[PDB]
Design a protein around this ligand. Structure first.
Ligand SMILES: N/C(=N\S(N)(=O)=O)N1CCCC1
Ligand SMILES: [Zn+2]
Length: 257
């Protein structure tokens, strides 16, 4: 089944998921000189004050922090978006070393990791119906660089020892995702896809320009997770990123001059 190894990683995914070679795949390199400021972009709105986190899960690829999405409680609106998108989960992608780990790149620069806050368009009623639509999802992407610790990340770091292996989960109520955001909401946006199988082309990507800083110790704890299940030989969960894909017929727009 799919993964990030030499035998089942990004170069193999197209055999089971032919849209891997599609017209609107993610991630991409963001060429900052080619991106164009778009004055049509409405102000972006991240409204997370009522977020209700539930659980953290090691799914064998990354770890997901899941939210209650039964009601408009944590939502993304504005920017390139029409309507309202509800937060369902966040997760990260990261490297074995600090010089790689992000999925998107900025003028070919790779960051140490990348946070994805995944949201679905409430006009489609459920996440499963949203992923049958070209405007079903919005993913807010945030780069991580190593420097000072991110206080709002530490509760995530500290629970990882309890979800070391694939299939393990833990309660993760009362987590505030506002603590993962940088100061600025300046962003780039383009139409793309999920970056893991099934690679569905449903996503409006919103990638923040400002990275957050996390400490070396925080990212080192990500790298102690395991891809494998309990009782199986240890496979460190590192380098769970897809590289940049062809831009094809797309324009990346900037929210900032
Ligand atoms: N790959 C994904 N999100 S991402 N990496 O495109 O943000 N997902 C797969 C199922 C739900 C979200
Ligand atoms: Zn992701």
């Amino acid at each position: 089944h799919w993964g990030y190894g030499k035998h089942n990683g990004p170069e193999h995914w197209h055999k089971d998921f032919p849209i891997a070679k599609g017209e609107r795949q993610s991630p991409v390199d963001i060429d900052t000189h080619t991106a164009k400021y778009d004055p049509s972009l409405k102000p972006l709105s991240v409204s997370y004050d009522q977020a209700t986190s539930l659980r953290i899960l090691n799914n064998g690829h990354a770890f997901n922090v899941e939210f209650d999405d039964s009601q408009d409680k944590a939502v993304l609106k504005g920017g390139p978006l029409d309507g309202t998108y509800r937060l369902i989960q966040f997760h990260f992608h990261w490297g074995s070393l600090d010089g790689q780990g992000s999925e998107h790149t900025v003028d070919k620069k790779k960051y140490a990791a990348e946070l994805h806050l995944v949201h679905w368009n409430t006009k489609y009623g459920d996440f499963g119906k949203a992923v049958q639509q070209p405007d079903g999802l919005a993913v807010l992407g945030i780069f991580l660089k190593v420097g000072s610790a991110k206080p709002g990340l530490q509760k995530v770091v500290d629970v990882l020892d309890s979800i070391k292996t694939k299939g393990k989960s833990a309660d993760f109520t009362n987590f505030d995702p506002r603590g993962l955001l940088p100061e600025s909401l300046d962003y780039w946006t383009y139409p793309g896809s999920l970056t893991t199988p099934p690679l569905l082309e449903c996503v409006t990507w919103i990638v923040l320009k400002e990275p957050i800083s996390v400490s070396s110790e925080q990212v080192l704890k990500f790298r102690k997770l395991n891809f494998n299940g309990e009782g199986e030989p240890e496979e460190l969960m590192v380098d769970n990123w897809r590289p940049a894909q062809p831009l094809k017929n797309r324009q990346i727009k900037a929210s900032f001059k």
